[PDB]
From a paper:
The HIV-1 Env is a trimer of gp120-gp41 heterodimers that are heavily shielded from the host immune systems by N-linked glycosylation and further protected from neutralization by conformational masking and considerable sequence variability. A glycosylated region near the base of the third variable loop (V3) of HIV-1 Env forms a supersite of vulnerability that is targeted by antibodies originating from diverse germline genes in multiple HIV-1 infected individuals. Here, we determine structures of antibodies in complex with HIV-1 Envelope for all observed members and ancestral states of the broadly neutralizing HIV-1 V3-glycan targeting DH270 antibody clonal B cell lineage. Here we used cryo-EM to visualize the interactions of a complete inferred DH270 clonal tree with the co-evolving virus Env.
The DH270 lineage is derived from the VH1-2*02 and Vλ2-23 heavy and light chain genes, respectively, with a heavy chain complementary determining region length of twenty amino acid residues, DH270.6, the lineage member with the greatest breadth and potency, neutralizes fifty-one percent of a multiclade pseudovirus panel with a geometric mean potency of ~0.21 µg/ml. From the I2 intermediate the clone splits into two paths, both culminating in similar neutralization breadth, albeit with DH270.6 having the greatest potency. The I2 intermediate acquired additional mutations at clusters 3, 4, and 7, with mature DH270.6, the most broad and potent antibody of the clone, further modifying interactions at cluster 7. The DH270.5 and DH270.6 antibodies acquired several mutations near the LCDR1/VL N-terminus where interactions with the N301-glycan D arms may occur. Densities consistent with both the V3 GDIK coupled and uncoupled V1 loop states were apparent in the DH270.6 bound trimer. Additional mutations in DH270.6 occurred near the N442-glycan and the V1 loop configuration that was displaced from the V3 GDIK motif. Examination of these structures indicates mutations after I2 occurred primarily at regions more distal to the epitope, consistent with the ability of I2 to neutralize most of the viruses neutralized by DH270.6. Additionally, structures of DH270.6 bound to d526 Env containing G300 and d949 Env containing N300 show few changes in the overall epitope conformation.
Residue numbers in the entry:
A (entry chain F): 194 to 244
B (entry chain K): 32 to 139, 150 to 185, 185a, 185b, 186 to 309, 312 to 321, 321c, 322 to 354, ...
C (entry chain A): 134 to 139, 150 to 185, 185a, 185b, 186 to 193
D (entry chain L), E (entry chain G), F (entry chain B): 520 to 547, 569 to 664
Write the structure that this text describes.
Amino acid sequence: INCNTSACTQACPKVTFEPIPIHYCAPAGYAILKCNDETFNGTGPCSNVST
Amino acid sequence: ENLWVTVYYGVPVWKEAKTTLFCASDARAYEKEVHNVWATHACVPTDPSPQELVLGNVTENFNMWKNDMVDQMHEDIISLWDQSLKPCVKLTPLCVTLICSNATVKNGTVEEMKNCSFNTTTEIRDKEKKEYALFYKPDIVPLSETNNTSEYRLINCNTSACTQACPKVTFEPIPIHYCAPAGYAILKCNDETFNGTGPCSNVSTVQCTHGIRPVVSTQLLLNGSLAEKEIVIRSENLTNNAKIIIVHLHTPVEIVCTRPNNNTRKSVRIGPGQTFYATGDIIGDIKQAHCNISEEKWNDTLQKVGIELQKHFPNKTIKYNQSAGGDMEITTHSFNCGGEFFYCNTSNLFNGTYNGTYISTNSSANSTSTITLQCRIKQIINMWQGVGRCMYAPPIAGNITCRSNITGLLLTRDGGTNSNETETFRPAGGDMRDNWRSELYKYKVVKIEPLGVAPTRCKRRV
Amino acid sequence: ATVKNGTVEEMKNCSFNTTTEIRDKEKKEYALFYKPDIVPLSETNNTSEYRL
Amino acid sequence: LGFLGAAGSTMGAASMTLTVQARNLLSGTVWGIKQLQARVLAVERYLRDQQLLGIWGCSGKLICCTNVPWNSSWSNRNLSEIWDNMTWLQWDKEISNYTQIIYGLLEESQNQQEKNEQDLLALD
Amino acid sequence: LGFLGAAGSTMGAASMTLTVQARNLLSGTVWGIKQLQARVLAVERYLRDQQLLGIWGCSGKLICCTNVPWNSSWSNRNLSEIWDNMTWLQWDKEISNYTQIIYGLLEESQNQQEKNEQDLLALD
Amino acid sequence: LGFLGAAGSTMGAASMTLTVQARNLLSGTVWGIKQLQARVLAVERYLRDQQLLGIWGCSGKLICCTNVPWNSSWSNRNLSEIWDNMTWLQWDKEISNYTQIIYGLLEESQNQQEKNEQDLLALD
Ligand SMILES: *[C@@H]1O[C@H](CO)[C@@H](O[C@@H]2O[C@H](CO)[C@@H](O)[C@H](O)[C@H]2NC(C)=O)[C@H](O)[C@H]1NC(C)=O
Ligand SMILES: *[C@@H]1O[C@H](CO)[C@@H](O[C@@H]2O[C@H](CO)[C@@H](O)[C@H](O)[C@H]2NC(C)=O)[C@H](O)[C@H]1NC(C)=O
Ligand SMILES: *[C@@H]1O[C@H](CO)[C@@H](O[C@@H]2O[C@H](CO)[C@@H](O)[C@H](O)[C@H]2NC(C)=O)[C@H](O)[C@H]1NC(C)=O
């Protein structure tokens, strides 16, 4: 089905496609706020807040 | 009492040193898409809030031919322009033997373009097919010296594997500002009487330079800044006959030209996924590519250049000739026009003489009288030595048109012999740096030395 | 390995077809290689056929 | 007066106008790795100069005078031909040959003021 | 109280708890050159803020009071309705419109002190 | 004495010569992006140590003494047992286990001096 659109590649069979859990961290000078309200409906205020 | 040593911080003391300067672009060019052109791709958006600041009793000596800014601009251009060609097609299967017949476009013979046909290894690679395209005779070489004269080749593939520029980047000369990094400043000389080296009194400091247009050109300078008072002559040693003597104009000249040949783009698939663009049929009659300059303004300009040349040569006249034979990139005015590459024969521009006594340049015979330069067009470009040294320029449909201002000249004095009363001149070209050195001439960069020491009556108390 | 008649015991004279720079005018060429760099092509019997 | 408007003005005029020059020593942007290299070099230069003010006990933009007497061979100048007329550029064009003298003499000035304060903070 | 646990506490409670927030302003690691760019930007921000405290004669975490009289157009507030109730976030949501004035006024009152002290270390 | 010539000298011998050691903490060059990473790591380390000196009111190279009394469990040594005989390396080989309380106790020393100074700068 290729070769008329692109010449593409085989994935290397020694990397894997496992969904590794990846954490995101703020660098120096910033912070991550997390809303602990489970009633949060997409927009608006939150009171139970952690960093 | 005596005096005692005291330090001061924040002291206006300059040093001269080499440094790395970044680029800034006009902010409207950041309306454009990502990976489009150099502005959004690599530079920083500008903001003219820190304007020019004039200085007072300062006095600084500038040097034009020792300027490191152009020698860094050349490498910045060479690296960015080498980086811009990577995602494009690398050609390679187009190096096949070409079979070229007579140039029967609509009967007759088109004298510049040959109709050639070649076998294309298609994207399936086992269903190779015949294709045909029209090529320019500078891009076409005979394959062998024998009398098999219907067998041809591209001018590449014996020297390098060439490349096609991607037809979604552009070759528009975006004005690029050079700015000073942290702890640095740019001195600008406001004396228009500055003759290349020496002191300058009206001095300002700027955070970013004037917008430089990086137009690659030979024997003439395209769109660029104009001189402030009159025609300026710059040479490192004016007596030296091997040194390129640059002429900067006050009154601009207007040049307008075109390719009056209604071309058509053809698409060929070369290998898997990637395409190639060539010249297909030609619709309409065949016309010659040419460029036009108004005659009275050109004669006025060359007589004024002779007037300024008589400020360094006492009683001799001024004569000109064409370039010394040369090759295509050296002997002809080579400039970009909308993506195409023009090479114009400059001899008709310089078949004239200034006798040392200037004649009234109106003297009205016809204001519509023009001088006309025949121009040839290449597609395979041998653009710079050491860049990724080949590039193929894809053709663009319809008649192109472009219009610009001539503001500068490049000259070489033909060798002074027999004590001749002309010391005639030829147009020059070659190293592109003296184009940019025609624009970066007002600028220097200074290392800020903030810490100073002075004697003061002050004494520290315990 | 007839260098000037006789046999050089280390260097084999080999010839091969080179796809030239035009790619449709491939030509014969010859070179001398060292026997550590030269392997017989197949275990099936054809003894004058070699590989890098 | 901005980054460099103080140049040309005399000693008395440039005794002021320090911070508007010295505050613009930190910036940086993107064209490549070379600009990051120049940015880190500028940061390291400012930090080194702030350190050199750090040894001598100055630690500020103020007029930091030490107690070492001025030898005549460094300037050979009257006070009137330093303050009334001179500006900093052609002052530096005279004084700049004595860096290994002056920049060691102020470290000797912070030699001559430290242990005789530590004893007066302990033995008193 | 860590990096941001002091938020929501009043003026008096957050007059303390400064260094455990302000000490965590420098870090960095690897995912690419973009993290180097963000790390150098963080160092530049912290160094610029230390400099801006550096001109005004503060040069520390200390409660650095200068001598400009407070103008009523910046707060229009009583002492009780600043210290007894208010917290810094919605205090900043009032005062933040005047920052380019206030950050100039403290340099203006550094343009009132050290030349006088220089004359009181020289002419005395 | 340069960058490390003070090592092996005694406590009273190395009470001096701090500056020529600590002045050589900032440099960098090119072999790749890794050297730039190590360069900004060195700049970060020096800036962090300057910050930790800035917390305690030291802010200099000086012999910064605070007022917290020494506890005997940290050294158990006589004054002669510390000063005339020891060098700094085998002193560190004893004291280095108590960093997590000493580097908090000097912040506690900056607790016990600040708001009192503010009240003696305001209520007086
Ligand atoms: C270029 O040459 C090609 C031959 O490959 C020409 O195409 C043929 O022209 C003849 C003459 O009219 C026709 O009989 C064929 O049907 C054409 N073949 C194809 C595939 O179109 C082409 O006309 C020439 N073009 C120019 C501009 O000279
Ligand atoms: C292609 O050529 C046509 C005709 O030569 C150009 O159309 C004329 O352009 C001139 C420019 O000075 C105008 O004055 C005329 O009014 C235009 N029309 C006619 C009917 O002559 C056309 O501009 C050219 N193509 C491009 C892209 O410039
Ligand atoms: C390697 O083999 C080549 C054969 O391809 C030899 O070249 C030929 O040698 C014969 C014998 O003298 C000549 O008749 C031919 O004219 C040669 N051909 C060419 C193209 O030169 C070559 O001599 C051999 N070389 C060595 C070192 O063994």
